[PDB]
Amino acid sequence: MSEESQAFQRQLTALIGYDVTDVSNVHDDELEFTRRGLVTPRMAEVASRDPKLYAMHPWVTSKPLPEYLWKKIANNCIFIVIHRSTTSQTIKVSPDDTPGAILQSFFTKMEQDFVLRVCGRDEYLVGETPIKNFQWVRHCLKNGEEIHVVLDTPPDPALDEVRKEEWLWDCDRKFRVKIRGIDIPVLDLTVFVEANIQHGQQVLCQRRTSPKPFTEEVLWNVWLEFSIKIKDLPKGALLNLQIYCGVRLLYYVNLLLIDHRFLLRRGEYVLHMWQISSFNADKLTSATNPDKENSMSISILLDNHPIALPKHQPTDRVRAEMPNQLRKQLEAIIATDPLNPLTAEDKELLWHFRYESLKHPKAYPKLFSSVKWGQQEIVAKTYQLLARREVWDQSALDVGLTMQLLDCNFSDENVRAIAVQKLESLEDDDVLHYLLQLVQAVKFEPYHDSALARFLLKRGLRNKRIGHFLFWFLRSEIAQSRHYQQRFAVILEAYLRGCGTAMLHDFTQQVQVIEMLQKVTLDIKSLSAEKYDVSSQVISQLKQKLENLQNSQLPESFRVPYDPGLKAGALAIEKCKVMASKKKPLWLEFKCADPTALSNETIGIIFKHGDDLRQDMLILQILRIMESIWETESLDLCLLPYGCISTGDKIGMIEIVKDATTIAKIQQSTGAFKDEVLNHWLKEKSPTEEKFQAAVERFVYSCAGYCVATFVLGIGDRHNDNIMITETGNLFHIDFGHKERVPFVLTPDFLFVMGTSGKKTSPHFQKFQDICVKAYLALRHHTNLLIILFSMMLMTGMPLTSKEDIEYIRDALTVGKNEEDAKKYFLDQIEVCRDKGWTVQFNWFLHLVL
């Protein structure tokens, strides 16, 4: 009974990597209160989700086929191949044809319960969408391939079954907190404590303490009194205790003043605080350190029969005209970039004229940053403002903006909630583009249960794909983030309890696999020095240990975390080789458990341990965004954002791109380089000089995409050790752990392929200057969306600290200039790489000296 639940919770705890029943690290029931809250939205979505479509999770889009995918048209005819057993029959189809409409034309060209499954994958060509609007199809086209499909039985919705779940204002006293003392084990200095009252990163009030000698224990007993009445404390307000050294910041911890029940905080607390190895998302956490045996502590008293916060209640339609030169200043402000700080006057002006600012949704981020949140009366005037959301509600979703209201500068439930309301109108296609961000954006939420959380949860349970990646993006944080694992765990359990028995069995297999393969790598790296190269007594112990796990542990087949349609199966021991890198990665390879697989190409995975893979993920998920932004302007820069998921602490997986070789291995075929080796290698891997020319094309595109991209994200200056290229001309970076500086890697060996030397030009290189600016300006259009993604990436991924760090992308997009001053700028930079050729490429080699 409650024994088939303690084996289930035993199941769920394993899948998660955190025991959501553990209270060994909390001073209230917010995490639990939240486990309980989320039951409804789960159950609503499980309740409402359609069984057939959920099982087939058709991956479609409601976008317009780009100009370029039309030029592969073939006179309004797309050919689709079907296979029942050994059979197969091409079939002309219209792009606007549906799936149903196509079994109709097929049954009569050659008992209604057959769905077109894709050959080799668990991807389904079903439902009421033009087949031109399926992503699997738009893919085969982009890549010039052959839409293979096998007619067979619709998968059973009974497998997606789910187990039924068993389960005032007006106190004028200035607010005080008594700092009793600090206590730490192994600590000769001087040290005080700083008590900030925070709200979305701004300090409402701050009162420090008397410095004192740095011993293992330090008392004070002070009553600390702040300037701020207890009526003006805003819901979400943080009491933030920090501890400085003499000067430098060394410890922090945080406590919500208003709890989840709206009650204020009364009482005695002993808070375990986080140590520091400037803005960072771990500085905002309400979580306390769980390593109570080593971490600094702190004790404090909240005197405060209990005082509680009232949920505002809706209640001035008078209108006056606005001078010209004021509305000039308003509209000027509202136009500026997110990263533009507001002067106190810009603020008084924005707030003063708040009803005219409400008309431009683009002024919402700047305006809700103009609120004295330390002022009970202001704050309400604000609630009454968000009640007049006629224009917001009607506004076309703008994601740059929505995001902005979910970053660290906004900590007010009502604001954030309107951003989320806008997220609702996103088709699942777009949710996947931004899911990682909108999972990271949960770090800036003040309370565990939030509307953002309930949105990730709805959307994830409604579509299986999103589901899958929601699992791994969450499991990735829970495992390497002590500041947020407890919050994310409550959420992931929430999702798991509604995804179906079908996917539990699947995540159970992916995790076990990853669980073993973690093991092998560790064992294997502990035999080779960060110095040592690759031993053959090692190559014997690898194929020893895989031969082993293959001959027992690894299940017949598991789904591929970075690409879940694909089922991998049996190991290709022969191909599996530890790689040369100092951090000793595992080049792996599997056959595809799917009998209907067209090719024999294997599934190629690179288990790495030694570094945090979450920084690769963020960078990639942005490039995938840049592409979709090059699709809305009919542009395709052939990027290769390889799959790369993080699975646990400092270890994850990467996708191996078939038949691709670095630049460096191309050159070393005493650090010199030669130009012709580019082409020589291309022509050698182009059977015909026809395919050779297709290849030189990718190279112009790909090379150009990756130079714009890399320039923007400030990661252009790489070493050819870290650039690669497929046999078919496609160029792309790897390893994102990122004297004379180069804006990006455009070394003379590329130019050569473009057919140029020293200071010349050619039919390709003029093209390449052509495409680049098309691609650059295209981004400049979406400046705001990119700044806010960049900013949020630093704060939730690159321990980022500096506000000047972001003032970068500002300049790199060169804001507030016309499409000319820019196109120059860029093409100026294209040139700087010419005036430098290899000098820097050479230095990444000579570096091994300094």
Annotated binding site for ATP: 604-613, 639-647, 732-738
What is the three-class DSSP state of 419? helix
- Alpha-carbon distance of 123 to 566, in angstroms, equals 9
User: Are the C-beta atoms of 51 and 462 separated by less than 8 Å?
Assistant: no
CB of 650 to ligand L64, least distance (A): 8
611 touches ligand L64 (CB under 6 A): yes
Query: 491 pairs with which residues across the strands?
Result: none
CB of 59 to ligand L64, least distance (A): 23
- Alpha-carbon distance of 761 to 847, in angstroms, equals 32
100 touches ligand L64 (CB under 6 A): no
CB of 738 to ligand L64, least distance (A): 8
Comparing CB distances to ligand L64, the nearer of 420 and 592 is 592
Burial class (CB in 10 A: 0-12, 13-18, 19+), 661: middle
CB of 347 to ligand L64, least distance (A): 39
Comparing CB distances to ligand L64, the nearer of 711 and 736 is 736
Query: 213 pairs with which residues across the strands?
Result: 190
CB of 749 to ligand L64, least distance (A): 15
Comparing CB distances to ligand L64, the nearer of 606 and 622 is 606
- Alpha-carbon distance of 296 to 184, in angstroms, equals 4
Q: What would the two tokens of residue 692 be?
A: 């050779």
Comparing CB distances to ligand L64, the nearer of 542 and 664 is 664
76 touches ligand L64 (CB under 6 A): no
CB of 726 to ligand L64, least distance (A): 9
Comparing CB distances to ligand L64, the nearer of 28 and 735 is 735
CB of 674 to ligand L64, least distance (A): 16
Detail the residues annotated as belonging to a binding site: 604-613, 639-647, 732-738
Residue 246, Cα to own-chain centre: how many angstroms? 38
Q: Which residues contact 88 (CB under 8 A, 6 or more apart)?
A: 81, 82
CB of 668 to ligand L64, least distance (A): 7
Contact letters for ligand L64, residues 563-602 (x by CB under 6 A): ----------------xxx---------------------
Comparing CB distances to ligand L64, the nearer of 336 and 662 is 662
Comparing CB distances to ligand L64, the nearer of 185 and 737 is 737
By CB under 6 A, what part of segment 637-676 binds ligand L64?
642, 654, 656-657, 660, 662, 664-665
Place of tokens 């804001």: 815
DSSP of 790-816, one letter per residue? HHHHHHHH-----STTTHHHHHHTT-S
CB of 645 to ligand L64, least distance (A): 11
Comparing CB distances to ligand L64, the nearer of 234 and 643 is 643
How many amino acids of this chain bind ligand L64 (CB under 6 A)?
22
> From its phi and psi, is residue 423 left (phi > 0), alpha (psi between -120 and 50) or beta?
alpha
Q: Which stretch binds ligand L64 (CB under 6 A): 121-129, 267-275, 284-292, 612-620?
A: 612-620
CA distances from 546 to 388, 557, 585, 666 (A): 63, 15, 15, 30
Comparing CB distances to ligand L64, the nearer of 218 and 619 is 619
Nearest CA to 254 among 444, 37, 449?
A: 444
User: Are the C-beta atoms of 769 and 708 separated by less than 8 Å?
Assistant: no
CB of 444 to ligand L64, least distance (A): 22
> Which residue among 243, 542, 605, 613 contacts ligand L64 (CB under 6 A)?
613
C-beta atoms surrounding 180 within 10 Å? 16
User: Are the C-beta atoms of 460 and 54 separated by less than 8 Å?
Assistant: no
> Which residue among 493, 506, 594, 612 contacts ligand L64 (CB under 6 A)?
612
DSSP of 525-585, one letter per residue? HTTS-SS----HHHHHHHHHHHHHHHTTTS-S-EE-TTSTTPEEEEE-GGG-EE-SSTT--
281 touches ligand L64 (CB under 6 A): no
> Which residue among 202, 615, 634, 679 contacts ligand L64 (CB under 6 A)?
615
CB burial readout 105-138, b (16+ within 10 A) else e: ebeeeeeeebbbbbbbbbbbbbbebbbbbbebbb
- Alpha-carbon distance of 730 to 679, in angstroms, equals 13
For ligand L64, which residue has the nearest CB? 737
C-alpha torsion angle, residues 266, 271, 273, 279 (rounded to 10) = -10
Q: Which stretch binds ligand L64 (CB under 6 A): 23-31, 149-157, 313-321, 610-618?
A: 610-618
Comparing CB distances to ligand L64, the nearer of 179 and 620 is 620
Place of tokens 């082993």: 548
CB of 530 to ligand L64, least distance (A): 12
Comparing CB distances to ligand L64, the nearer of 518 and 662 is 662
Backbone angles phi, psi at 198, to 5 degrees: -95, 155
Comparing CB distances to ligand L64, the nearer of 385 and 653 is 653
Contact letters for ligand L64, residues 357-376 (x by CB under 6 A): --------------------
User: Are the C-beta atoms of 673 and 838 separated by less than 8 Å?
Assistant: yes
Q: Kindly report the CA angle at 274 between 273 and 280, in degrees rounded to 5?
A: 130
By CB under 6 A, what part of segment 728-747 binds ligand L64?
734-737
- Alpha-carbon distance of 602 to 472, in angstroms, equals 23
CB of 568 to ligand L64, least distance (A): 16
- Alpha-carbon distance of 294 to 185, in angstroms, equals 6
- Alpha-carbon distance of 833 to 827, in angstroms, equals 10
CB of 667 to ligand L64, least distance (A): 9
616 touches ligand L64 (CB under 6 A): yes
Q: What are 754-760's contacts with CB under 8 Å, separation 24+?
A: 754/700, 757/675, 759/834
Comparing CB distances to ligand L64, the nearer of 270 and 580 is 580
> Which residue among 194, 356, 721, 727 contacts ligand L64 (CB under 6 A)?
721
Residue 479, Cα to own-chain centre: how many angstroms? 16
Comparing CB distances to ligand L64, the nearer of 179 and 725 is 725
Comparing CB distances to ligand L64, the nearer of 654 and 703 is 654
Nearest CA to 414 among 175, 200, 172, 198?
A: 200
CB of 285 to ligand L64, least distance (A): 22
User: Are the C-beta atoms of 791 and 804 separated by less than 8 Å?
Assistant: no
> Which residue among 197, 606, 678, 700 contacts ligand L64 (CB under 6 A)?
606
CB of 658 to ligand L64, least distance (A): 8
Contact letters for ligand L64, residues 517-556 (x by CB under 6 A): ----------------------------------------
Binding interface with ligand L64 (CB under 6 A)? 579-581, 606, 611-613, 615-616, 642, 654, 656-657, 660, 662, 664-665, 721, 734-737
